[model samples]
Target: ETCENVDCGPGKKCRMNKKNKPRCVCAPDCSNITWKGPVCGLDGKTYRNECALLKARCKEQPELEVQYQGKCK
Candidate 1:
């Protein structure tokens, strides 16, 4: 039940992947400004924001998992 305004970052849009998960697909000029909100990744480190976290995850590859929506304990 994914909505239209889900997690497709800047220059991207939300689309269903083969697994039916909310996969972010490329779009035009979807730039999103970095927010100050922090979140903990599977690596156990806090990211700057959703944008920053997503960027980091992309770099780290499949091992990195998206943790909770707040800073790590």
Candidate 2:
């Protein structure tokens, strides 16, 4: 599954290694961090974008994920 299939957790991504199943790895480059909109996390918190959300998610809050688009309301 992707951290993106699992959805790759933003700053990270899903990549397959030599002859093995898919694996999760930290993203090498995230060349863009502009105007992707906002997402409200499952924790009732707001993030800049899914990218920002997953970066924080991969760090902590395994239970954390984006709830919906837009600010928490």
Candidate 3:
């Protein structure tokens, strides 16, 4: 069981909450965020992408913003 929530299991992907508890999820694909490339906020100066919970589904394709200033995608 992927209840471990560290990652996807045999042919199954695990959607994890803050405490690493496995939440109900489907396979990872364009239909899932693990694949289609989640909306990202990149900081060239900081060299990392910071993701936040806008309470939006990853499949929803929410718009990405940079430094909470400009829209990235």
Candidate 4:
């Protein structure tokens, strides 16, 4: 439960399940899809969209996740 509000910090997300408490995980990938929207990763990186962001995460940090949708503030 310490991870309830734990900040993964950039390109990572928190996932919780009845069997699994809460842990950092890479956001979903959107390759081979058409999405023009912009998304921001917890890793303080801006991506073309969730697809691009997750793709990078898949190749790089498997812990990367989407912090929020749209450009980072």
The segments of candidate 3 whose C-alpha lies over 4 angstroms from its true place after superposition are: 1-12, 26-28, 31-73
What tens digits encode model 2's per-residue C-alpha lDDT throughout 10-40?
A: 4666777776668777562435644478999
lDDT of 4: 0.74
- TM-score of model 4 (CA atoms): 0.51
Residue 66 in model 3: lDDT: 37
The TM-score values for the models, in the order shown, are 0.45, 0.53, 0.20, 0.51
For candidate 2, list the clashing residue pairs, or say none.
2-5, 2-6, 2-7, 3-6, 3-7, 3-8, 4-7, 4-8
lDDT of each: 0.65, 0.71, 0.38, 0.74
Per-prediction RMSD in angstroms?
Answer: 9.7, 8.2, 9.6, 10.2
Off by over 4 Å in 4: 1-36
Clashing pairs in 3: none
Sorting all predicted structures by TM-score, with the top scorer first, yields 2, 4, 1, 3
- Model 3, C-alpha of 17: deviation from truth (Å): 1.4
Specify the poorest-scoring 10-residue window by lDDT in model 2.
1-10
Better of 3 and 4 by lDDT: 4
Residues 7-34, model 3: lDDT tens digits: 5433245666687667755343433323
